[PDB]
Amino acid sequence: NTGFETTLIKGIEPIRQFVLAISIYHLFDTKLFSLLIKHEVASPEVACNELGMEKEKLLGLFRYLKNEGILLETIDGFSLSKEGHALAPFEGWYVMLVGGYATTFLQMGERLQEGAGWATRDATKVGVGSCGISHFDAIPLTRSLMAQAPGTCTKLLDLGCGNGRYLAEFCKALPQIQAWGAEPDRGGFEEAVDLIEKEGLSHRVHISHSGAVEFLDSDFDFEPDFIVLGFVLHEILGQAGRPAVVNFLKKIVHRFPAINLIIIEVDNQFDNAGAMRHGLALAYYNPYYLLHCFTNQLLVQDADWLDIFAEAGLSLVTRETTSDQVDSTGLEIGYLLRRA
Amino acid sequence: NTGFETTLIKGIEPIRQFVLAISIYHLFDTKLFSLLIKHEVASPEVACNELGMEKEKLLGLFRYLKNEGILLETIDGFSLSKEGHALAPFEGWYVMLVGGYATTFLQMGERLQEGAGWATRDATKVGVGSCGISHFDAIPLTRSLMAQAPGTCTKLLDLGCGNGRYLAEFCKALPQIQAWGAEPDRGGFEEAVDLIEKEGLSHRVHISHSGAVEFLDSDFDFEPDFIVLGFVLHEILGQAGRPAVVNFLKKIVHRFPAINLIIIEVDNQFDNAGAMRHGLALAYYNPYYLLHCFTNQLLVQDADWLDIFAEAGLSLVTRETTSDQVDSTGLEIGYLLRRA
Ligand SMILES: NC(N)=NCCCC(=O)C(=O)O
Ligand SMILES: NC(N)=NCCCC(=O)C(=O)O
Ligand SMILES: [Mg+2]
Ligand SMILES: [Mg+2]
Ligand SMILES: [Mg+2]
Ligand SMILES: [Mg+2]
Ligand code: NA
Ligand code: NA
Ligand code: NA
Ligand code: NA
Ligand code: NA
Ligand code: NA
């Protein structure tokens, strides 16, 4: 086995990073990251008393993270290194892809078998995580499209709202807005009620435990002038089919003829060689397309969505992609539509 | 968010590799890797018929692996690239750390809480995976120590045998040996019975579904002259304590006074700054030490093991580390012992 060790260190580099990604996810999810930001330096004993943890297990996680350069160790205790501090904006990606979809990727081997069904996910962490990401890409994109509409937003409806971050950010920036969010996952719904309460927006924002299609079939007198469907239609498309998506969009404009619809979707370019060599396409969109083949969701192309909108009796006001400072792939597309 | 995308691509690089490590694990575990070696080129339809898989899910995994350069796509179908072919020797590491311990690392957040207990593992994949690794490190080390003993091996006992690879390799190379293996995990035990049958060694090798301590307490007339305890004592140490390890070793030499013991253990240097900067220490030993803090296992230092052996009434014939061509960390140590 001459020279085997050097080949082994490169050969298992994905395993080294696999354990690191899980450990970074727990550092955020358990509140240890925010505790280390607050305390600056914290001994295992102090962190255990504050979060109700066991010393020997916490010291093991801290020693592991110190060896990887995420933490520093002084006589007073452990602290986040400069590299560890720099992880702070990316929390949403770890919570969504590790917390939400680790079980989904681990189920791929068994779900490949004929008739084994769709892989499950932790929809609470998917909702919380994707909402954390939307602060950088989907919320600024929704704002740009809202500004180009022929009317001002007063009553906003967000279906598939996750933990309610889109509504929290839009309501703080636009104090006149009255909003209603709906989230089908119970864990995500409870996170949304808590985030709205924490931000002091319960008097202006209501949250319902409901799916997008059943919300439109339910009875209510609220008359929204804007509806946000952020990464919701591809779930309906996979679960119920294309005629169900067309009928869902027809029901929105039948019930609310003057509404403005803002739809955000990911253009499926999984088999586009050039698009998949972009650094962000390889880091995020390649595993995103993979998880969509194993779950009851279906991503389609930009032209396929425009065809669906035409069939549902909608007219396109404009369409845009995200800022090239956060995501320059051109794969995240936002559409502003009205009744034709 | 000026320049955010470039920071994001580096910030979520551990997530990109996390999904890749899981996908590489399934490529081996589902038999798709061996199918691609055998066929050279295979369309999704051919691979689905042979392994009983669904076309749309398999095409998704193949497109994902093509974008990462693990597979090539021609008009005839998909094939392993040169980089994909080069993964073949490392199967055991993926099966052990991803198949065996992915759930363990994912449970860290919940198991950190006071009184939450030890993290579980898939002991079948741990056994199968570690046995695949032993072909490179622990089996050649056991051979070197066996050659330095004052007697020849005729009757071998392997406690914690996994899928039985140590016994299969030693029996093929030394046709006079009669061997007995014991594995406590039922899945691993069934894999061992099948591997022994597949190799044509059932007439010379027996396998029992049993733990190491309960095997020595059970009744049998087999008189081994060699006993291999490969990464077994640190499980007993964590589960039952130091006096139980000492009593277990005393019972081996009380029952078999002329036996030769070959013990393989990992030296705990988790807090040794210099040792942890070795490329293999960071890739393998850093997550190995972390998983030992969350499971009912305890790794100790080389000197701590020598103290245990002296207390149990044992004399050290010699001790060695692995070949520097496969593992030059000096952390894997093999001990050859006899009754004092
Ligand atoms: N951040 C981007 N691009 N959107 C992803 C939203 C979540 C999603 O679609 C899923 O988890 O299925
Ligand atoms: N390959 C090496 N170094 N041995 C590890 C054996 C497995 C093990 O100890 C565990 O999974 O707990
Ligand atoms: Mg949404
Ligand atoms: Mg989706
Ligand atoms: Mg063993
Ligand atoms: Mg062990
Ligand atoms: Na959940
Ligand atoms: Na990728
Ligand atoms: Na799907
Ligand atoms: Na198992
Ligand atoms: Na590491
Ligand atoms: Na332990």
From Swiss-Prot, chains A, B:
It is an enzyme of class 2 (transferase). Pathway: Antibiotic biosynthesis. S-adenosyl-L-methionine-dependent methyltransferase involved in the formation of the rare amino acid 3-methylarginine (MeArg), which is used as a potent antibiotic against the closely related soybean pathogen P.syringae pv. glycinea. Transfers the methyl group from S-adenosyl-L-methionine into 5-guanidino-2-oxopentanoate acid to yield 5-guanidino-3-methyl-2-oxopentanoate, a precursor of MeArg. The keyword Transferase applies. NCBIfam families: ketoArg_3Met. It comes from Pseudomonas syringae pv. syringae. Transmembrane segments: none annotated. Optimum pH is 9. This is 2-ketoarginine methyltransferase. Disruption phenotype: Disruption mutant cannot produce MeArg. Belongs to the 2-ketoarginine methyltransferase family. It catalyses: 5-guanidino-2-oxopentanoate + S-adenosyl-L-methionine = (3R)-5-guanidino-3-methyl-2-oxopentanoate + S-adenosyl-L-homocysteine + H(+). The keyword Glycosyltransferase does not apply. Keywords: Antibiotic biosynthesis, Methyltransferase, S-adenosyl-L-methionine, Transferase. SUPFAM superfamilies: S-adenosyl-L-methionine-dependent methyltransferases. One of its GO terms (molecular function) is S-adenosylmethionine-dependent methyltransferase activity. Coiled coil: none annotated. Its EC number is 2.1.1.243. Optimum temperature is 45 degrees Celsius. GO terms for biological process: antibiotic biosynthetic process; methylation.
